[PDB]
Design a protein around this motif. Structure first.
Motif, PDB file in Angstrom:
ATOM      1  N   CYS A  17       0.861  -1.184   0.000  1.00  0.00           N
ATOM      2  CA  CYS A  17       0.000   0.000   0.000  1.00  0.00           C
ATOM      3  C   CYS A  17       0.896   1.232   0.000  1.00  0.00           C
ATOM      4  O   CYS A  17       1.448   1.606   1.046  1.00  0.00           O
ATOM      5  N   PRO A  18       1.062   1.895  -1.149  1.00  0.00           N
ATOM      6  CA  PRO A  18       1.987   3.040  -1.190  1.00  0.00           C
ATOM      7  C   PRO A  18       1.680   4.112  -0.158  1.00  0.00           C
ATOM      8  O   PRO A  18       2.611   4.682   0.424  1.00  0.00           O
ATOM      9  N   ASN A  19       0.410   4.414   0.081  1.00  0.00           N
ATOM     10  CA  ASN A  19       0.021   5.359   1.127  1.00  0.00           C
ATOM     11  C   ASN A  19      -0.406   4.612   2.389  1.00  0.00           C
ATOM     12  O   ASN A  19      -1.548   4.691   2.840  1.00  0.00           O
ATOM     13  N   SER A  20       0.541   3.877   2.962  1.00  0.00           N
ATOM     14  CA  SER A  20       0.256   3.100   4.158  1.00  0.00           C
ATOM     15  C   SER A  20       0.053   4.019   5.354  1.00  0.00           C
ATOM     16  O   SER A  20       0.766   5.012   5.523  1.00  0.00           O
ATOM     17  N   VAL A  21      -0.928   3.681   6.185  1.00  0.00           N
ATOM     18  CA  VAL A  21      -1.261   4.447   7.379  1.00  0.00           C
ATOM     19  C   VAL A  21      -1.127   3.531   8.584  1.00  0.00           C
ATOM     20  O   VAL A  21      -1.744   2.461   8.629  1.00  0.00           O
ATOM     21  N   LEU A  22      -0.328   3.953   9.558  1.00  0.00           N
ATOM     22  CA  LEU A  22      -0.142   3.200  10.787  1.00  0.00           C
ATOM     23  C   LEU A  22      -1.167   3.634  11.822  1.00  0.00           C
ATOM     24  O   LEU A  22      -1.445   4.827  11.973  1.00  0.00           O
ATOM     25  N   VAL A  23      -1.727   2.660  12.534  1.00  0.00           N
ATOM     26  CA  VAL A  23      -2.688   2.914  13.600  1.00  0.00           C
ATOM     27  C   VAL A  23      -2.193   2.182  14.838  1.00  0.00           C
ATOM     28  O   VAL A  23      -2.093   0.949  14.835  1.00  0.00           O
ATOM     29  N   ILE A  24      -1.889   2.931  15.891  1.00  0.00           N
ATOM     30  CA  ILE A  24      -1.477   2.357  17.165  1.00  0.00           C
ATOM     31  C   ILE A  24      -2.705   2.271  18.058  1.00  0.00           C
ATOM     32  O   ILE A  24      -3.359   3.283  18.328  1.00  0.00           O
ATOM     33  N   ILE A  25      -3.018   1.065  18.517  1.00  0.00           N
ATOM     34  CA  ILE A  25      -4.186   0.812  19.348  1.00  0.00           C
ATOM     35  C   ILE A  25      -3.683   0.371  20.713  1.00  0.00           C
ATOM     36  O   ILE A  25      -3.184  -0.750  20.870  1.00  0.00           O
ATOM     37  N   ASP A  26      -3.821   1.245  21.706  1.00  0.00           N
ATOM     38  CA  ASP A  26      -3.377   0.942  23.060  1.00  0.00           C
ATOM     39  C   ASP A  26      -4.433   0.079  23.735  1.00  0.00           C
ATOM     40  O   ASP A  26      -5.488   0.578  24.142  1.00  0.00           O
ATOM     41  N   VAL A  27      -4.153  -1.220  23.856  1.00  0.00           N
ATOM     42  CA  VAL A  27      -5.114  -2.140  24.459  1.00  0.00           C
ATOM     43  C   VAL A  27      -5.157  -2.033  25.973  1.00  0.00           C
ATOM     44  O   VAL A  27      -6.021  -2.655  26.602  1.00  0.00           O
ATOM     45  N   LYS A  28      -4.250  -1.267  26.576  1.00  0.00           N
ATOM     46  CA  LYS A  28      -4.233  -1.020  28.018  1.00  0.00           C
ATOM     47  C   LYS A  28      -4.094   0.480  28.245  1.00  0.00           C
ATOM     48  O   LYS A  28      -3.048   0.958  28.697  1.00  0.00           O
ATOM     49  N   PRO A  29      -5.137   1.256  27.944  1.00  0.00           N
ATOM     50  CA  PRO A  29      -5.013   2.719  27.976  1.00  0.00           C
ATOM     51  C   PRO A  29      -5.077   3.265  29.393  1.00  0.00           C
ATOM     52  O   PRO A  29      -6.139   3.282  30.024  1.00  0.00           O
ATOM     53  N   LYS A  30      -3.933   3.717  29.897  1.00  0.00           N
ATOM     54  CA  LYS A  30      -3.870   4.434  31.169  1.00  0.00           C
ATOM     55  C   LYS A  30      -3.886   5.935  30.878  1.00  0.00           C
ATOM     56  O   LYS A  30      -2.885   6.644  30.979  1.00  0.00           O
ATOM     57  N   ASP A  31      -5.059   6.404  30.479  1.00  0.00           N
ATOM     58  CA  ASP A  31      -5.252   7.793  30.069  1.00  0.00           C
ATOM     59  C   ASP A  31      -6.752   8.035  29.941  1.00  0.00           C
ATOM     60  O   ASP A  31      -7.569   7.180  30.302  1.00  0.00           O
ATOM     61  N   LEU A  32      -7.114   9.211  29.429  1.00  0.00           N
ATOM     62  CA  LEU A  32      -8.504   9.600  29.198  1.00  0.00           C
ATOM     63  C   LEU A  32      -8.588  10.160  27.780  1.00  0.00           C
ATOM     64  O   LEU A  32      -8.386  11.358  27.565  1.00  0.00           O
ATOM     65  N   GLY A  33      -8.880   9.297  26.815  1.00  0.00           N
ATOM     66  CA  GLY A  33      -8.958   9.744  25.438  1.00  0.00           C
ATOM     67  C   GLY A  33      -9.198   8.586  24.495  1.00  0.00           C
ATOM     68  O   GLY A  33      -9.471   7.460  24.915  1.00  0.00           O
ATOM     69  N   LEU A  34      -9.092   8.888  23.203  1.00  0.00           N
ATOM     70  CA  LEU A  34      -9.336   7.892  22.177  1.00  0.00           C
ATOM     71  C   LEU A  34      -8.241   6.827  22.231  1.00  0.00           C
ATOM     72  O   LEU A  34      -7.129   7.098  22.691  1.00  0.00           O
ATOM     73  N   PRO A  35      -8.523   5.607  21.774  1.00  0.00           N
ATOM     74  CA  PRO A  35      -7.505   4.552  21.792  1.00  0.00           C
ATOM     75  C   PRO A  35      -6.680   4.432  20.521  1.00  0.00           C
ATOM     76  O   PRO A  35      -5.745   3.625  20.494  1.00  0.00           O
ATOM     77  N   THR A  36      -6.987   5.203  19.483  1.00  0.00           N
ATOM     78  CA  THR A  36      -6.325   5.092  18.191  1.00  0.00           C
ATOM     79  C   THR A  36      -5.499   6.341  17.920  1.00  0.00           C
ATOM     80  O   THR A  36      -5.969   7.462  18.141  1.00  0.00           O
ATOM     81  N   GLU A  37      -4.274   6.139  17.446  1.00  0.00           N
ATOM     82  CA  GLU A  37      -3.424   7.209  16.946  1.00  0.00           C
ATOM     83  C   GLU A  37      -2.946   6.825  15.555  1.00  0.00           C
ATOM     84  O   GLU A  37      -2.388   5.741  15.367  1.00  0.00           O
ATOM     85  N   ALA A  38      -3.163   7.711  14.589  1.00  0.00           N
ATOM     86  CA  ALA A  38      -2.844   7.446  13.194  1.00  0.00           C
ATOM     87  C   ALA A  38      -1.609   8.231  12.778  1.00  0.00           C
ATOM     88  O   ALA A  38      -1.485   9.421  13.083  1.00  0.00           O
ATOM     89  N   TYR A  39      -0.698   7.556  12.080  1.00  0.00           N
ATOM     90  CA  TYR A  39       0.541   8.152  11.609  1.00  0.00           C
ATOM     91  C   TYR A  39       0.753   7.794  10.147  1.00  0.00           C
ATOM     92  O   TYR A  39       0.374   6.706   9.704  1.00  0.00           O
ATOM     93  N   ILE A  40       1.362   8.712   9.401  1.00  0.00           N
ATOM     94  CA  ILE A  40       1.685   8.515   7.994  1.00  0.00           C
ATOM     95  C   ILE A  40       3.149   8.868   7.785  1.00  0.00           C
ATOM     96  O   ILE A  40       3.630   9.886   8.295  1.00  0.00           O
ATOM     97  N   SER A  41       3.863   8.020   7.050  1.00  0.00           N
ATOM     98  CA  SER A  41       5.287   8.231   6.823  1.00  0.00           C
ATOM     99  C   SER A  41       5.498   9.361   5.826  1.00  0.00           C
ATOM    100  O   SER A  41       4.863   9.393   4.767  1.00  0.00           O
ATOM    101  N   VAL A  42       6.394  10.285   6.164  1.00  0.00           N
ATOM    102  CA  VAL A  42       6.667  11.451   5.337  1.00  0.00           C
ATOM    103  C   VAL A  42       8.152  11.773   5.401  1.00  0.00           C
ATOM    104  O   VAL A  42       8.822  11.516   6.405  1.00  0.00           O
ATOM    105  N   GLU A  43       8.661  12.343   4.314  1.00  0.00           N
ATOM    106  CA  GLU A  43      10.039  12.813   4.270  1.00  0.00           C
ATOM    107  C   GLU A  43      10.122  14.204   4.879  1.00  0.00           C
ATOM    108  O   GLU A  43       9.359  15.101   4.507  1.00  0.00           O
ATOM    109  N   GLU A  44      11.048  14.385   5.813  1.00  0.00           N
ATOM    110  CA  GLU A  44      11.211  15.638   6.536  1.00  0.00           C
ATOM    111  C   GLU A  44      12.512  16.296   6.099  1.00  0.00           C
ATOM    112  O   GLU A  44      13.584  15.693   6.213  1.00  0.00           O
ATOM    113  N   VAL A  45      12.417  17.528   5.607  1.00  0.00           N
ATOM    114  CA  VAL A  45      13.572  18.320   5.206  1.00  0.00           C
ATOM    115  C   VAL A  45      13.807  19.383   6.268  1.00  0.00           C
ATOM    116  O   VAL A  45      12.879  20.103   6.652  1.00  0.00           O
TER     117      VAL A  45
END
Lengths: 94, 50, 286
Positions: C112-140
């Motif tokens: 998938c050229p535009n791959s999207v990473l999703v981190i799912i914290d199955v043990k969330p010690k916090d108050l918020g959504l369980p999903t965080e989405a990241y996309i790989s990008v070149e940084e200059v």
């Protein structure tokens, strides 16, 4: 350098600091705004400039510690208000 | 003697400013904790079973 | 560029099941897998997922193994069962980003050229959504000079179809408290928002303490962003702001007062009706 709460410089002060006459202060400030170094406005009637944003710069460890102290104050205020709301509305939210 | 007894500045001769300004209170701080408490009381009365 | 990622509840529960089963097997800390889904013109939709064999050395961040042959086979079977879903990205339950994530993403970009990473914290010690989405990008950079591949955040949310919503609501007989009124508008926000803000500020404070003491080096970009934040912090003692605040508050309280008056009149009407009914009933019984 000026604190965020005042951040309202005057023509004579800018002239004294930059060693230019008061007349060229307006052009200097306009060049700064155009390039994008500072954001604000110019009020010729009152002879003042209201700077609202200056470019970020590299800070040393003492200034980082100052930022940490300011964060401490901010977090203390946040926690105080959270406790206030929780205590006062415990009846409706248990 | 009575001018000295009272808190009169004793400016020019027979000229004593009374400072009727009373400091002219202009500072305002948006009392916020008390207003939040009042609105939370409103909500409590609206929601609680009477 | 992705503007939003919608992760369906079935994906999350499947991730939880994968984590539980691999944990029961034992000797593992993070789980990895694929995220089948679809595109809706820059609004992603993650609908299904499947497990994938994965192992890593807890010391070396360069000894990791992902069975791409198994990935391809299971993707073929999932396509044979549901054509409308195509590989969109990979997920892992690791609480926070690991150092092998860019390498794994480079592997998955061949599917998938535009791959999207999703981190799912199955043990969330916090108050918020369980999903965080990241996309790989070149940084200059300007001083960091070499251009590295970094992960860029993307807004993630949870949505559901009708069947998924029905099932989740049926299963949610664990603790159900709707109270859409002021009670929920006080708990789901206000308190939750302040707690989350305190958490974020505490994270920033911890990083700043580490930097000041000397455990971590200075990051000019982080310092610049902090400067911008402290600059944005408004001033609430200005006369104009105070006056506007008072004006708006007065309007809102006018409306509130009118509503309360309506409520009082309705209550009086109900009392009069009830007294009429009771008096009539007593008269009839007498």
């Amino acid at each position: 350098t000026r604190p965020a709460n005042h951040r309202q410089l005057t023509f004579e002060e800018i002239a004294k600091s930059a060693k230019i006459t008061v007349n060229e202060v307006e052009l200097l400030v306009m060049k700064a705004l155009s390039v994008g170094l500072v954001k604000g406005s110019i009020d010729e009637v009152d002879k003042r400039v209201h700077m609202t944003w200056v470019q970020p710069r590299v800070l040393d460890l003492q200034q980082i510690k100052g930022m940490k102290d300011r964060l401490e104050f901010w977090c203390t205020d946040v926690k105080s208000m959270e406790m206030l709301v929780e205590h006062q509305a415990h009846d409706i939210l248990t | 003697d009575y001018a000295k007894k009272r808190g009169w500045v004793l400016g020019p001769n027979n000229y004593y400013s009374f400072a009727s300004q009373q400091q002219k209170p202009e500072d305002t701080t948006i009392p916020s904790t008390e207003l939040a408490k009042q609105v939370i009381e409103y909500a409590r009365q609206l929601e609680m079973i009477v | 560029a992705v503007q939003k990622v919608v992760v369906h509840p079935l994906v999350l529960l499947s991730v939880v099941d994968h984590f539980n089963r691999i944990g029961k097997v034992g000797n593992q800390k993070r789980v990895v897998g694929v995220l089948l889904g679809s595109w809706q013109k820059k609004v992603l939709d993650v609908s299904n997922s499947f497990a994938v064999p994965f192992d890593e050395d807890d010391k070396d961040d360069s000894v990791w193994f992902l069975d791409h042959d198994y990935l391809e086979n299971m993707y073929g079977m999932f396509k044979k069962v549901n054509a409308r879903e195509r590989i969109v990205g990979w997920y892992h339950t690791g609480p926070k980003l690991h150092k092998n994530d860019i390498a794994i993403n480079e592997l998955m970009k061949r599917y998938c050229p535009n791959s999207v990473l999703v981190i799912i914290d199955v043990k969330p010690k916090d108050l918020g959504l369980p999903t965080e989405a990241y996309i790989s990008v070149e940084e200059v950079h300007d001083d960091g000079t070499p251009t590295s591949k970094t992960f860029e955040h993307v807004t993630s949310e949870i949505g559901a179809e009708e069947a998924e919503e029905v099932g989740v609501e049926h299963l949610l007989r664990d603790i159900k408290d709707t109270t859409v009124g002021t009670l929920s508008q006080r708990i789901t926000n206000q308190v939750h928002g302040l707690k989350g803000l305190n958490s974020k500020l505490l994270d920033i404070r911890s990083y700043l303490e580490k930097v000041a003491t000397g455990k971590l080096p200075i990051n000019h970009q982080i310092i610049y962003q902090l400067q911008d934040v402290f600059n944005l912090l408004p001033d609430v003692s200005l006369q104009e702001f105070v006056k506007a605040f008072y004006l708006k508050t007065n309007d809102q309280m006018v409306v509130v007062y009118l509503a309360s008056l309506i409520r009082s009149v309705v209550a009086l009407h109900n009392l009069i009706n009830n007294k009429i009914a009771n008096r009539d009933a007593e008269k009839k019984e007498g």
